[PDB]
């Protein structure tokens, strides 16, 4: 089982630097070119560069959009790949993926990590306020207002409620995200049973439970 795990992402000031890491396993690392690819939220994939395999002397190439500003390196001993990003701007905000690339034969990225989110903004980290939304079938919700940066994870009953849920993409206004989540359940199960949305906002060590009271 091949695995790639990106790390190092977070909120960084415009003009800043950031080193991302990609820890790899399950394969003969030096056999492979390795790429970085990014994706701004809700937008397309963009290839940033690669570092070549043992055979090609570990040389590097970059896309025009980042050539001169980003540097890729690998530590063979650690089975690790790195991306050094300099002079970061807002449009560098994206999920950064590492991928296993070419081997000298197979023209492909078979394996990709889960990504590491990078946000480039001077906007301040702020925890959310969490507000209940209370009223056949009945719909409740939670409003998760005024947080930064992304992401938050909202669950219902720490995950035990998972059908009938719609968590909406956050929207940014004046440097704060707001989103809501709704859950639809049988009337004959609320308010006879309790319902609690749990909001986690890692970036600010925030974990909130808020019971939906009728």
């Amino acid at each position: 089982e091949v695995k790639l795990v990106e790390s190092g992402g977070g909120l960084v000031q415009p003009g800043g630097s950031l080193r991302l890491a990609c820890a790899t396993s399950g394969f003969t690392f030096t056999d492979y070119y390795m790429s970085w690819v990014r994706q701004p939220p809700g937008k397309a994939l963009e290839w940033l560069g690669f570092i070549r395999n043992k055979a090609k002397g570990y040389t590097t190439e970059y896309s025009a959009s980042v050539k001169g500003r980003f540097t890729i390196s690998r530590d063979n001993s650690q089975s690790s790949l790195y991306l050094q990003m300099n002079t970061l701007r807002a449009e560098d905000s994206a999920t950064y993926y590492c991928a296993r690339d070419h081997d000298g034969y197979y023209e492909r990225f078979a394996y990709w990590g889960q990504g590491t989110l990078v946000t480039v903004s001077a906007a301040k980290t702020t925890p959310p306020s969490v507000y209940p939304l209370a009223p056949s079938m009945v719909t409740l919700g939670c409003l998760v207002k005024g947080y930064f940066p992304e992401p938050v994870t909202v669950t219902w009953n720490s995950g035990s409620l998972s059908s009938g849920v719609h968590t909406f993409p956050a929207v940014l206004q004046s440097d704060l995200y707001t989103l809501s989540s709704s859950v639809t359940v049988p009337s004959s199960t609320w308010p006879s049973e309790t319902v609690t949305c749990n909001v986690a906002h890692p970036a600010s060590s925030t974990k909130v439970d808020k019971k939906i009271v009728p």
């Binding site: 397309a44 290839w47 197979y106 023209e107 492909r108 719909t139 707001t178 709704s182």
Partner: protein, 218 residues
């Protein structure tokens, strides 16, 4: 090298076939290996991309027969047959003839029967009403097709200021969409008005679905 995909999205019913196109700004056909260095990836919402096809028409191991890549030079296509709910994704082509470049993606949607939204309105929580502001929320849930109009009325007049709207991705379980609409006021402005109405106009009916409440009654 520039990659362009068309169309940017399209809708196909379950069990039917979709074709999506990918064009290159210069040929991807490697004369030495006799292969087009063009690959296809699938990316489901909030997930990592997955390899489907490489060398234009070679399916990655474990990819079913219902995915077919074709084409040559600058002209490629991915076809999916027996499209199922699992296929909800954005599909990207990627050239590896000179470095690598991704196309801008084609979003696959599942076409289903038209469906009227379930509309729910929520007043500001008492806890938010102990705060400086007040958010009125309306959910328009499980509808099809995806485009919908929401209008807010305060004391009988349309209010467009401080309305923010958000859409979910197509729902995996039933192929519907949902949207939230949030109207945010100061607490004082919230308390200077009484009637709050959320009006959803959807191609399903000529008449909007209307939910309202009067602040006085809660």
């Amino acid at each position: 090298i520039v990659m362009t995909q068309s169309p940017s999205s399209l809708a196909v019913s379950a069990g039917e076939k979709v074709t999506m196109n990918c064009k290159s700004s210069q040929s991807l056909l490697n004369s030495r290996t006799r292969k087009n260095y063009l690959a296809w990836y699938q990316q489901k919402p909030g997930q990592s991309p997955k390899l489907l096809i490489y060398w234009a028409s070679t399916r990655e191991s474990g990819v079913p027969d219902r995915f077919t890549g074709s084409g040559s030079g600058t002209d490629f296509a991915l076809t999916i047959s027996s499209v199922q709910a699992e296929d909800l994704a954005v599909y990207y082509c990627k050239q590896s003839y000179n470095l690598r470049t991704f196309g801008g993606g084609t979003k696959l949607e599942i076409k289903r029967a038209d469906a009227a939204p379930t509309v729910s309105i929520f007043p500001p929580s008492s806890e938010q009403l102990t705060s400086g502001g007040a958010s009125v929320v309306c959910f328009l849930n499980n509808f099809y097709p995806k485009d919908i109009n929401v209008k807010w009325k305060i004391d009988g007049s349309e209010r467009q200021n401080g309305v923010l709207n958000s859409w979910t991705d197509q729902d995996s379980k039933d192929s519907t969409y949902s949207m939230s609409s949030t109207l945010t006021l100061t607490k004082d402005e919230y308390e200077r008005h009484n009637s709050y109405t959320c009006e959803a106009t959807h191609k399903t009916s000529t008449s909007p679905i209307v939910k309202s409440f009067n602040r006085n009654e809660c």
